[PDB]
Ligand binder design. Structure first.
Ligand SMILES: *[C@@H]1O[C@H](CO)[C@@H](O)[C@H](O)[C@H]1NC(C)=O
Ligand SMILES: *[C@@H]1O[C@H](CO)[C@@H](O)[C@H](O)[C@H]1NC(C)=O
Ligand SMILES: *[C@@H]1O[C@H](CO)[C@@H](O)[C@H](O)[C@H]1NC(C)=O
Ligand SMILES: *[C@@H]1O[C@H](CO)[C@@H](O)[C@H](O)[C@H]1NC(C)=O
Ligand SMILES: *[C@@H]1O[C@H](CO)[C@@H](O)[C@H](O)[C@H]1NC(C)=O
Ligand SMILES: *[C@@H]1O[C@H](CO)[C@@H](O)[C@H](O)[C@H]1NC(C)=O
Lengths: 50, 595
């Protein structure tokens, strides 16, 4: 569970750019307010290698 | 910004978490199935609980998206699959009572022991002994005693359970915006939103009837022939004008007629096409059997097996110290992991079953690119149909001569073709009226067409009218004679076998015309034909993303169920049955004239 990847981002990455932000992805109209739930997902997901 | 993009992001997060949790659950279930130990039992229980809770919370978050403003068919299909309440729509007390009822039906069916009166020191179970006494015994009163005793005990202990079960399932379906539980089961074949390929829930029953109306003459001839052969077995008990006695069908319930090959053989002097002796003389181990199946699958053009398949599958019984489930099962664990749980014996039957399960694995392998909730067959018939076509093709004499099991000097005359086709008819055509009768009875009892106090009288009448089998003695409503079967007692759909049977021969004709076979359909082999494999893989790659009507149009060029391939397969056997039914009377009467 130590390998992660970014699944959600507002815009595409520029070439040779990194994003280490852990901001909750706001997919809807309601503000996330930093708490996950419905229509507010954490962007970094684990690569559960087996 | 729109609802559809929210649905896409939610489905992406659901798909990632679902594939991880499903993989853990499937790995724990695999560890239980190949190693029956209590820590594996509790691990499987914990993983199943976490999986059920995960789908509960994801369905709770999924029902906040209305479907009427979504135009993409794939997203609509995934959300329609996810938003199904199941048994969760009821109150906690009623849901708990429903799960308790299902569990106690499972325990009654699994631990149902029926034995002889006045000898209670030990008793015999259904799966080890009753199947053997039903399939191998030739004594009329012994089979009558076993049949009546098991149905009497199981019916008296299961009738109020089924009485509550029908009401609870009806309440569940009507709460889920369905007409009845039969409509809920028919909803798997429902296609909505696609122009030209639309299929309704209500239409399927008349479609089944439309197929069955053409099924009925061939089965009648087979029934007459079977009756004649049973007349050889039982001289005075069976009437020429009446139906067959119920406890003479070779199984506990009459589902399969394949146990009557010894009694109903056309030509007993001719040998069979059993190649078990060739395997045991040349020492064909299970690994090389699966390698031969892989060679068959690469002959048709499908991709070969993965390395993890060979590493992780257990294709041999481990030993006495480690207990494993002997049932042949194909496992799609997720994340590209495909396994077969099979305790292989060196027989032709295990060879065909290995081909069937590898067909299941290939079907699972093809739709790996699809999203997780669409990683299934387009309907419940396709998944078994694509394995049964491989079981059909591998059993041909041409394939056995190709792989060295059968000698090149073997003479394939019409008599062995007739007896092989009759064995296939007893396996395949025999189960069709029983399946249609049972499903139509279940549909009417869920619909409320059948009154509560008229169940058995209706059921036996349909058995007289559809299957052509008469009861030994009349049964009142203290008995529950349908509930003795495994599928109905444990809440399983039964129309999948009928649809699988039709799709099997439809796919067989489509591949054989694709592969340019110039002979009869039963001699056809799909080996060494890349175009047939590509035509099949076009359906295999879709998974559940497209409607099953569209997949059927992709394979056979028709968008509806057709019975013409099945009758075309059994055409020389049909002519033979027409030839030898001149003296006998085709058809049956609903009177109780035999018994
Ligand atoms: C099966 O479970 C037992 C339980 O301890 C274990 O010892 C054994 O190694 C397991 N077998 C395999 C093949 O994992
Ligand atoms: C539906 O969504 C999938 C991704 O989930 C996309 O590939 C496809 O193009 C969409 N269909 C239409 C008609 O936009
Ligand atoms: C599932 O049940 C909940 C609770 O009654 C309900 O709000 C929801 O609409 C149901 N979903 C479907 C698809 O019937
Ligand atoms: C499958 O086939 C490919 C080429 O067709 C080959 O490179 C690969 O080694 C094969 N895998 C197995 C397990 O035989
Ligand atoms: C098999 O073919 C031969 C040759 O025509 C024929 O005499 C015989 O009656 C046929 N047998 C059957 C069962 O059709
Ligand atoms: C299929 O191809 C293999 C290898 O090319 C060959 O050995 C086999 O005989 C072929 N099968 C048939 C039925 O011609």
């Amino acid at each position: 569970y130590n390998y992660l990847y970014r699944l959600f981002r507002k815009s595409n990455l520029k070439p040779f750019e990194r994003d280490i932000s852990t901001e909750i992805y706001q997919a809807g109209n309601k503000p996330c307010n930093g708490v996950a739930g419905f229509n507010c997902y954490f962007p970094l997901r684990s690569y559960g290698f087996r | 910004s729109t609802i559809e993009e929210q649905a896409k992001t939610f489905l992406d997060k659901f798909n990632h978490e679902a594939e991880d949790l499903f993989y853990q659950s499937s790995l724990a279930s695999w560890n239980y199935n190949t190693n029956i130990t209590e820590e594996n039992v509790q691990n499987m229980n914990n993983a199943g609980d976490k999986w059920s809770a995960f789908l509960k919370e994801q369905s709770t978050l999924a029902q906040m998206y209305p479907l009427q403003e979504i135009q993409n068919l794939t997203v609509k299909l995934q959300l329609q699959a996810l938003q199904q309440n199941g048994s969760s729509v009821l109150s906690e007390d009623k849901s708990k009572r429903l799960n308790t009822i299902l569990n106690t039906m499972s325990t009654i069916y699994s631990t149902g022991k029926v034995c002889n009166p006045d000898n209670p020191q030990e008793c015999l179970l259904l799966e080890p002994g009753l199947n053997e006494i039903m399939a191998n015994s030739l004594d009329y009163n012994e089979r009558l005693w076993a049949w009546e005793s098991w149905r009497s005990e199981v019916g008296k202990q299961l009738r109020p359970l089924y009485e509550e079960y029908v009401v609870l399932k009806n309440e569940m379906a009507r709460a889920n915006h369905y007409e009845d539980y039969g409509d809920y089961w028919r909803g798997d074949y429902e296609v909505n939103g696609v122009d030209g390929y639309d299929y309704s829930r209500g239409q399927l029953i008349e479609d089944v009837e439309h197929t069955f109306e053409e099924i009925k003459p061939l089965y009648e001839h087979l029934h007459a022939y079977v009756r004649a052969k049973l007349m050889n077995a039982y001289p005075s008990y069976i009437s020429p004008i009446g139906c067959l006695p119920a406890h003479l069908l070779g199984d506990m319930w009459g589902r399969f007629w394949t146990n009557l090959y010894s009694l109903t053989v056309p030509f007993g002097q001719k040998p069979n096409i059993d190649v078990t002796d060739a395997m045991v003389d040349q020492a064909w181990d299970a690994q090389r059997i699966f390698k031969e199946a892989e060679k068959f699958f690469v002959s048709v053009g499908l991709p070969n097996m993965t390395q993890g398949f060979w590493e992780n599958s257990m294709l041999t019984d481990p030993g006495n110290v480690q207990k494993a489930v002997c049932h042949p099962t194909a496992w799609d664990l997720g994340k590209g992991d495909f396994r077969i749980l099979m305790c292989t014996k060196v027989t032709m039957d295990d060879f065909l079953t290995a081909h069937h399960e590898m067909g299941h694995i290939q079907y699972d392998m093809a739709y790996a690119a699809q999203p997780f909730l669409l990683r299934n067959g387009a309907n419940e018939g396709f998944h078994e149909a694509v394995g049964e076509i491989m079981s059909l093709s591998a059993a041909t004499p041409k394939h056995l001569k190709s792989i060295g099991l059968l000698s090149p000097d073997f003479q394939e005359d019409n008599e062995t073709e007739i007896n092989f086709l009759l064995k296939q008819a007893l396996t395949i055509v025999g189960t069709l009226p029983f399946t249609y009768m049972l499903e139509k009875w279940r549909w009417m009892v869920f619909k409320g067409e059948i009154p509560k106090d008229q169940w058995m009288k209706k059921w036996w009448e349909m058995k007289r009218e559809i299957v052509g089998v008469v009861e030994p003695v009349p049964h009142d409503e203290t008995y529950c004679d349908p509930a003795s079967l495994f599928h109905v007692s444990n809440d399983y759909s039964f129309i999948r076998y009928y649809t699988r049977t039709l799709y099997q021969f439809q796919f067989q004709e489509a591949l054989c015309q694709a592969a340019k076979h110039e002979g009869p359909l039963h001699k056809c082999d799909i080996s060494n034909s890349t175009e047939a494999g590509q035509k099949l893989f076009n359906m295999l790659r879709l998974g559940k993303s497209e409607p099953w009507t569209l997949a059927l149009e992709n394979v056979v060029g028709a968008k509806n169920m057709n019975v013409r391939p099945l009758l075309n397969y059994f055409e020389p056997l049909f002519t033979w049955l027409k030839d030898q039914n001149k003296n006998s009377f085709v058809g049956w009467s609903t009177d109780w004239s035999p018994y």
